[PDB]
């Protein structure tokens, strides 16, 4: 299930592939998992003790992974000890740096959509970036905003905060 760029799979990636096979044949998700594979998997630390798994999947399959994103996240977080799991497409080996960052940010928060962006300049001269998410999916991704900020900081290097506006 892991197809890296001509390299040996890591122990964590191998474990992710093992869990994916277990879901593939034992559970009732065979019709979708059979055609799907991942590229890489990584674990990072956020929020002073929290842990996040990033599953890098190939781009042409990403849309298909969106069909069963919620089920896979729910199963994998239970398989692990509550660590937050996110699925992200594999962009870096077309698109500029900003486009790649925007695509990563879109994939990172997938159940909720990005509807707006604000920058506030404080009196000290610093800047704060706020990204607006839809109100319809607030309860599903409300607890993962710190995880999203940490993952985006780790991958891109930029500080981003997440909010839910009242008006659509």
């Amino acid at each position: 299930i892991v197809k890296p760029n001509g390299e040996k799979p890591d122990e964590f990636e191998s474990g992710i592939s093992q869990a994916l096979l277990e879901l593939e044949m034992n559970s009732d998700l065979k019709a979708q998992l059979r055609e799907l594979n991942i590229t890489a998997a990584k674990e990072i630390e956020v929020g002073g003790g929290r842990k996040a798994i990033i599953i890098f999947v190939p781009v042409p399959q990403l849309k298909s992974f969106q069909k069963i994103q919620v089920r896979l996240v729910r199963e994998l977080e239970k398989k692990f000890s509550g660590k937050h799991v996110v699925f992200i497409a594999q962009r870096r080996i077309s698109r500029t740096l900003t486009a790649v960052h925007d695509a990563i940010l879109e994939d990172l928060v997938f159940p909720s959509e990005i509807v707006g962006k604000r920058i506030r300049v404080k009196l000290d001269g610093s800047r704060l970036i706020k990204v607006h998410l839809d109100k319809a999916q607030q309860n599903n991704v409300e607890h993962k905003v710190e995880t999203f900020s940490g993952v985006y900081k780790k991958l891109t290097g930029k500080d981003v905060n997440f909010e839910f506006p009242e008006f659509q």
């Binding site: 191998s14 093992q18 096979l21 277990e22 593939e24 044949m25 034992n26 559970s27 509550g82 409300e142 607890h143």
Partner: protein, 83 residues
């Protein structure tokens, strides 16, 4: 032409409950012949079942929220004195 989806072979890697039926605790106790020791074992296991297992800790957001309702109710009870 079949495999168990685990690279290493072990009795702990069998991955039971994948297909078929589930096995509850009562299926172990039912067939064995009745005895006084079996009766007290059943009583002990029932008393164990009576105890409550620890729930998963809630997310930080709803923990903070519940803190807000608790504190607000306490403050409202305090403020009702001045009416």
């Amino acid at each position: 032409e079949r495999s168990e989806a685990s690279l290493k072979v072990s009795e702990f890697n069998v991955s039971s409950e994948g297909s078929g039926e589930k096995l509850v605790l009562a299926d172990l106790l039912e067939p064995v012949k009745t005895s006084s020791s079996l009766a007290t074992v059943k009583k002990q296991l029932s008393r164990v079942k009576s105890k409550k297992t620890v729930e998963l800790p809630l997310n930080k957001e709803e923990i903070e929220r519940i803190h807000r309702e608790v504190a607000f109710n306490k403050t409202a009870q305090v403020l009702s004195k001045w009416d």
